[PDB]
Amino acid sequence: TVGSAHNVTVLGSGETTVVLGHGFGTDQSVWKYLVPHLTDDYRVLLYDNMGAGTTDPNLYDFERYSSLEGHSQDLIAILEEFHVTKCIFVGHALSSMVGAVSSIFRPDLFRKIVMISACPRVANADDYYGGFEEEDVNQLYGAMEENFQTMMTGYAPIVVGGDLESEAMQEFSRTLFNMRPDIALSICRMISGYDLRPYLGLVVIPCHIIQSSKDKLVPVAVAEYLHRNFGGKSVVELIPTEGHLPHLSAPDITIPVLIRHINQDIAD
Ligand SMILES: CC1=C[C@H](OC[C@@H]2C(=O)O[C@@H]3c4ccccc4C[C@H]23)OC1=O
Ligand SMILES: [Cl-]
Ligand SMILES: [Cl-]
């Protein structure tokens, strides 16, 4: 019963399956503007990450999900029970990295990864600009732990971006507050604590790096970092738009970019 655990939804028709993973704060409905454009040529599988508001909180193994590997094996188990191989993995934020790690362990399950707002490490290092100094992110988490609803009412507009009181601004706010707070904090400890830079050379399946030109959470430098350190074919396309969830806040300009990168491969 894994399909129930992650609310796996399956539809469309085709020879190769497109898998859709979401990021923190939302769930699979994040892809409302993408699903209809694929179902005429592909099977489409959607799944929620464990911890999302639509999942049973009794299933959030805190020890297992204390690291990205826990979610990576969830994705492998999902793909296995639905008989998915050589899939096209389209992942936003978290799921993109979960997908990338999974493709290292089980390259038989992935043909390519299309990723949006991907981040291999939240904080700045030497040789790496990820947005915020580690010292300061630690305060952003610690204050979120001290006063959860207050500072996430803050956080949510900064992440969605754009005009206040929009569909994406109200949708993300709704799904974000549907998470149980202790689960949300564990997920945040996991994300703010991971560092995938040494893993990137082990990802050798082709990676399409798509990201916003004005994302508070992922600077443009992060995409050129990914493009330079991935172990296989890769490519970068910027989207002239603001926000962390372009696929939801600006579908007219983001969806055709995703489609082209889903449809088309990478030339030598
Ligand atoms: C899955 C995903 C990753 C990327 O966020 C990372 C994180 C998030 O947004 O606040 C989380 C948080 C919590 C405390 C400190 C920093 C961060 C940044 C974290 O954006 C996403 O959707
Ligand atoms: Cl536990
Ligand atoms: Cl186009």
Short mmCIF file of C-alpha atoms and ligand atoms in Angstrom, two decimals:
data_model
loop_
_atom_site.label_atom_id
_atom_site.label_comp_id
_atom_site.label_asym_id
_atom_site.label_seq_id
_atom_site.Cartn_x
_atom_site.Cartn_y
_atom_site.Cartn_z
CA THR A 1 0.00 0.00 0.00
CA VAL A 2 2.71 2.54 -0.92
CA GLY A 3 0.35 4.22 -3.40
CA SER A 4 -1.86 5.16 -0.47
CA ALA A 5 1.12 6.28 1.64
CA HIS A 6 2.20 8.95 -0.85
CA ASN A 7 -1.20 9.51 -2.53
CA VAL A 8 0.28 8.23 -5.78
CA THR A 9 -1.85 9.32 -8.73
CA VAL A 10 -1.41 7.65 -12.12
CA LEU A 11 -2.95 8.69 -15.45
CA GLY A 12 -2.21 9.42 -19.08
CA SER A 13 -1.04 6.97 -21.71
CA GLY A 14 2.37 6.35 -23.23
CA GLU A 15 5.47 4.20 -23.38
CA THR A 16 7.60 6.25 -20.95
CA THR A 17 6.33 7.60 -17.64
CA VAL A 18 6.84 11.15 -16.35
CA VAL A 19 7.16 11.27 -12.55
CA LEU A 20 6.32 14.50 -10.71
CA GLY A 21 7.77 15.34 -7.29
CA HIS A 22 7.03 18.50 -5.32
CA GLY A 23 8.97 20.69 -2.91
CA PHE A 24 8.64 21.73 0.71
CA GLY A 25 5.43 23.45 1.72
CA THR A 26 3.23 21.99 -1.03
CA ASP A 27 2.05 18.68 -2.51
CA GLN A 28 1.39 17.12 -5.92
CA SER A 29 -1.39 19.58 -6.84
CA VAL A 30 1.57 21.96 -7.36
CA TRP A 31 1.59 20.60 -10.94
CA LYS A 32 -1.98 21.58 -11.86
CA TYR A 33 -0.79 23.60 -14.87
CA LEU A 34 1.67 20.91 -16.03
CA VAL A 35 -0.27 17.62 -15.87
CA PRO A 36 -2.78 18.33 -18.71
CA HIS A 37 -0.02 19.04 -21.25
CA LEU A 38 1.63 15.63 -20.73
CA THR A 39 -1.20 13.11 -20.38
CA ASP A 40 -1.73 12.75 -24.15
CA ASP A 41 1.79 11.34 -24.74
CA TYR A 42 3.01 10.03 -21.37
CA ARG A 43 1.92 8.07 -18.39
CA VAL A 44 2.05 10.52 -15.49
CA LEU A 45 2.80 9.55 -11.89
CA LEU A 46 2.46 12.05 -9.06
CA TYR A 47 3.43 11.43 -5.44
CA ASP A 48 3.58 13.51 -2.28
CA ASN A 49 6.68 13.46 -0.13
CA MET A 50 6.20 12.01 3.33
CA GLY A 51 5.56 14.85 5.76
CA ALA A 52 3.36 16.85 3.39
CA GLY A 53 0.02 17.84 4.87
CA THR A 54 -1.80 15.31 2.68
CA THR A 55 0.14 12.39 4.22
CA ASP A 56 -0.54 10.55 7.47
CA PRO A 57 1.64 12.06 10.24
CA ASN A 58 1.85 8.60 11.83
CA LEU A 59 4.02 7.59 8.85
CA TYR A 60 6.63 10.33 9.40
CA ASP A 61 9.50 8.28 10.79
CA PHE A 62 11.55 11.11 12.31
CA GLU A 63 14.79 9.12 12.37
CA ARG A 64 14.39 7.91 8.78
CA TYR A 65 13.53 11.36 7.42
CA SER A 66 16.30 13.05 9.41
CA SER A 67 18.31 12.66 6.19
CA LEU A 68 17.55 12.88 2.48
CA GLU A 69 18.22 9.15 2.03
CA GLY A 70 14.88 8.35 3.67
CA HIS A 71 12.96 10.22 0.98
CA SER A 72 15.24 8.77 -1.71
CA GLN A 73 14.21 5.23 -0.78
CA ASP A 74 10.55 6.28 -0.68
CA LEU A 75 10.89 7.34 -4.32
CA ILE A 76 12.61 4.07 -5.26
CA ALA A 77 9.83 2.11 -3.54
CA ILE A 78 7.15 4.19 -5.28
CA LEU A 79 8.70 3.62 -8.70
CA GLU A 80 9.07 -0.10 -8.00
CA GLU A 81 5.51 -0.85 -6.98
CA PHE A 82 4.09 0.94 -10.07
CA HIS A 83 6.48 -0.89 -12.47
CA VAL A 84 8.32 2.26 -13.55
CA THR A 85 11.68 2.14 -15.32
CA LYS A 86 13.65 4.68 -17.36
CA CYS A 87 11.33 7.39 -16.10
CA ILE A 88 11.48 11.10 -16.81
CA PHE A 89 11.74 12.62 -13.33
CA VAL A 90 10.47 16.19 -13.02
CA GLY A 91 11.16 17.43 -9.50
CA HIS A 92 10.79 20.81 -7.83
CA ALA A 93 13.23 21.82 -5.08
CA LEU A 94 13.49 18.95 -2.56
CA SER A 95 12.30 16.16 -4.83
CA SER A 96 14.87 17.17 -7.44
CA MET A 97 17.67 16.33 -5.00
CA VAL A 98 15.85 13.23 -3.76
CA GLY A 99 15.55 12.22 -7.40
CA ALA A 100 19.21 12.94 -8.13
CA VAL A 101 20.39 10.85 -5.17
CA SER A 102 18.02 8.02 -6.14
CA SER A 103 19.42 8.02 -9.68
CA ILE A 104 22.91 7.39 -8.28
CA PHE A 105 21.73 4.28 -6.44
CA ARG A 106 19.27 3.01 -9.08
CA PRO A 107 20.12 4.43 -12.53
CA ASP A 108 17.85 1.73 -13.98
CA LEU A 109 14.85 3.81 -12.85
CA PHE A 110 15.75 7.16 -14.47
CA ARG A 111 16.32 8.32 -18.04
CA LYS A 112 16.66 12.02 -17.17
CA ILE A 113 15.96 14.56 -14.44
CA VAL A 114 14.24 17.87 -15.05
CA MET A 115 14.70 20.00 -11.93
CA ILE A 116 13.35 23.39 -10.90
CA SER A 117 14.60 25.55 -8.01
CA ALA A 118 17.14 22.85 -7.15
CA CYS A 119 19.58 23.41 -4.29
CA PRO A 120 22.47 21.10 -3.29
CA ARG A 121 23.14 23.08 -0.07
CA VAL A 122 21.29 25.99 1.53
CA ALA A 123 24.16 27.88 3.13
CA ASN A 124 27.26 29.49 1.66
CA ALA A 125 30.56 27.64 1.79
CA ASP A 126 33.96 28.51 0.48
CA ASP A 127 33.77 28.19 -3.33
CA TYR A 128 29.96 28.10 -3.07
CA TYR A 129 27.32 30.85 -2.85
CA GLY A 130 23.95 29.38 -1.93
CA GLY A 131 22.34 32.57 -0.68
CA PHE A 132 22.80 32.86 3.08
CA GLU A 133 25.69 32.37 5.46
CA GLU A 134 25.26 29.18 7.50
CA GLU A 135 25.44 31.13 10.76
CA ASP A 136 22.42 33.16 9.67
CA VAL A 137 20.26 30.33 8.34
CA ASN A 138 20.67 28.67 11.74
CA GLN A 139 18.97 31.73 13.23
CA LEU A 140 16.18 31.51 10.65
CA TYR A 141 15.52 27.91 11.66
CA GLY A 142 15.93 28.55 15.38
CA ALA A 143 13.42 31.38 15.34
CA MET A 144 11.00 29.24 13.31
CA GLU A 145 11.27 26.68 16.12
CA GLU A 146 10.68 29.35 18.79
CA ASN A 147 7.51 30.77 17.17
CA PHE A 148 6.32 28.60 14.30
CA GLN A 149 3.15 30.11 12.83
CA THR A 150 4.39 33.68 13.27
CA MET A 151 7.59 33.31 11.28
CA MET A 152 6.11 31.07 8.58
CA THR A 153 3.38 33.63 7.97
CA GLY A 154 6.47 35.72 7.34
CA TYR A 155 8.36 33.11 5.32
CA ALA A 156 5.59 32.18 2.88
CA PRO A 157 5.32 35.49 0.92
CA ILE A 158 9.12 35.73 0.69
CA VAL A 159 9.19 32.30 -0.96
CA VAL A 160 6.20 32.53 -3.32
CA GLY A 161 7.16 36.03 -4.42
CA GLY A 162 5.18 38.29 -6.70
CA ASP A 163 1.98 40.14 -5.91
CA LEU A 164 0.38 39.57 -2.53
CA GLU A 165 -2.92 37.70 -2.39
CA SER A 166 -2.49 35.60 -5.54
CA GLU A 167 -3.42 32.02 -6.37
CA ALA A 168 0.12 30.79 -5.74
CA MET A 169 0.46 33.05 -2.69
CA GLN A 170 -2.76 31.67 -1.18
CA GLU A 171 -2.29 28.06 -2.31
CA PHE A 172 1.23 27.67 -0.91
CA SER A 173 0.14 29.42 2.29
CA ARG A 174 -2.72 26.92 2.61
CA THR A 175 -0.67 23.76 2.01
CA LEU A 176 2.26 25.07 4.08
CA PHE A 177 0.10 25.43 7.20
CA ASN A 178 -1.47 21.99 6.63
CA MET A 179 1.82 20.36 7.66
CA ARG A 180 2.10 19.39 11.31
CA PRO A 181 4.67 21.84 12.72
CA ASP A 182 7.01 19.26 14.27
CA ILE A 183 7.15 17.42 10.94
CA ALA A 184 7.83 20.70 9.13
CA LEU A 185 10.71 21.47 11.49
CA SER A 186 12.26 18.02 11.01
CA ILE A 187 12.06 18.50 7.23
CA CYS A 188 13.69 21.92 7.65
CA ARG A 189 16.48 20.50 9.81
CA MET A 190 17.04 17.87 7.12
CA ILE A 191 17.20 20.37 4.25
CA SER A 192 19.26 23.05 5.99
CA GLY A 193 21.67 20.32 7.10
CA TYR A 194 22.32 18.43 3.88
CA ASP A 195 25.28 19.03 1.58
CA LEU A 196 25.20 17.19 -1.75
CA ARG A 197 28.23 18.85 -3.41
CA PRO A 198 30.36 15.65 -3.12
CA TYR A 199 27.48 13.63 -4.62
CA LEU A 200 27.03 15.72 -7.78
CA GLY A 201 29.87 14.03 -9.65
CA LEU A 202 28.14 10.70 -9.03
CA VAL A 203 24.96 11.88 -10.79
CA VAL A 204 25.62 10.93 -14.43
CA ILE A 205 22.07 10.68 -15.86
CA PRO A 206 21.28 13.84 -17.91
CA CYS A 207 20.08 16.76 -15.78
CA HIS A 208 18.07 19.73 -17.07
CA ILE A 209 18.67 22.63 -14.65
CA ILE A 210 15.76 25.10 -14.76
CA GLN A 211 15.44 27.90 -12.25
CA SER A 212 14.13 31.39 -11.56
CA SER A 213 16.09 34.54 -12.30
CA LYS A 214 14.85 36.12 -9.01
CA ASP A 215 14.46 33.36 -6.40
CA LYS A 216 15.14 34.53 -2.84
CA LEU A 217 16.01 30.93 -1.95
CA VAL A 218 18.21 29.88 -4.90
CA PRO A 219 20.64 32.35 -6.55
CA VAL A 220 21.60 32.02 -10.20
CA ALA A 221 25.11 31.03 -9.08
CA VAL A 222 23.65 27.78 -7.71
CA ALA A 223 22.57 26.69 -11.20
CA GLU A 224 26.00 27.38 -12.68
CA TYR A 225 27.43 25.41 -9.76
CA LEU A 226 25.18 22.44 -10.55
CA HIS A 227 25.95 22.75 -14.27
CA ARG A 228 29.69 22.66 -13.51
CA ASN A 229 29.78 19.79 -10.99
CA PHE A 230 27.18 17.27 -12.22
CA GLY A 231 28.86 14.11 -13.47
CA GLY A 232 27.01 13.81 -16.78
CA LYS A 233 25.24 15.81 -19.48
CA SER A 234 23.51 18.92 -18.16
CA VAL A 235 22.13 22.27 -19.30
CA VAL A 236 20.83 25.48 -17.73
CA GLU A 237 17.86 27.60 -18.77
CA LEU A 238 16.86 30.66 -16.77
CA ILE A 239 13.25 31.79 -16.49
CA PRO A 240 12.79 35.59 -16.33
CA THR A 241 10.48 35.47 -13.31
CA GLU A 242 10.40 35.98 -9.55
CA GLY A 243 9.63 33.33 -6.95
CA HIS A 244 10.51 29.88 -5.68
CA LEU A 245 7.61 28.01 -7.35
CA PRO A 246 7.55 29.25 -10.96
CA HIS A 247 5.55 26.22 -12.12
CA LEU A 248 2.64 27.53 -10.00
CA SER A 249 3.06 31.33 -9.83
CA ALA A 250 3.90 31.80 -13.53
CA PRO A 251 2.79 28.76 -15.56
CA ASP A 252 2.35 30.65 -18.85
CA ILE A 253 6.12 31.21 -18.89
CA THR A 254 7.40 28.18 -16.99
CA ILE A 255 5.29 25.30 -18.34
CA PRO A 256 6.54 25.65 -21.95
CA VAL A 257 10.12 25.55 -20.63
CA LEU A 258 9.42 22.36 -18.67
CA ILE A 259 7.70 20.74 -21.66
CA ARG A 260 10.61 21.50 -23.99
CA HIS A 261 13.08 20.02 -21.50
CA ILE A 262 10.87 16.98 -20.90
CA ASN A 263 10.44 16.44 -24.64
CA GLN A 264 13.95 17.19 -25.89
CA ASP A 265 17.28 15.59 -25.01
CA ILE A 266 20.76 17.12 -24.64
CA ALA A 267 23.17 17.27 -27.58
CA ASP A 268 26.89 16.57 -27.23
C1 LIG B 1 12.19 21.74 -0.67
C2 LIG B 1 12.75 23.11 -0.77
C3 LIG B 1 13.99 23.41 -0.45
C4 LIG B 1 14.15 24.77 -0.62
O1 LIG B 1 13.94 25.17 0.72
C5 LIG B 1 14.71 24.89 1.80
C6 LIG B 1 14.10 25.32 2.90
C7 LIG B 1 12.95 26.12 3.04
O2 LIG B 1 12.47 26.49 1.98
O3 LIG B 1 12.86 26.77 4.29
C8 LIG B 1 13.61 25.82 5.02
C9 LIG B 1 14.47 26.34 6.03
C10 LIG B 1 14.31 26.21 7.34
C11 LIG B 1 15.23 26.70 8.25
C12 LIG B 1 16.35 27.31 7.73
C13 LIG B 1 16.49 27.40 6.35
C14 LIG B 1 15.63 26.85 5.52
C15 LIG B 1 15.47 26.93 4.14
C16 LIG B 1 14.61 25.72 4.08
O4 LIG B 1 12.81 25.22 -1.18
C17 LIG B 1 12.05 24.15 -1.19
O5 LIG B 1 10.87 24.09 -1.56
CL CL B 2 10.31 8.31 15.08
CL CL B 3 8.70 27.70 -26.26
#
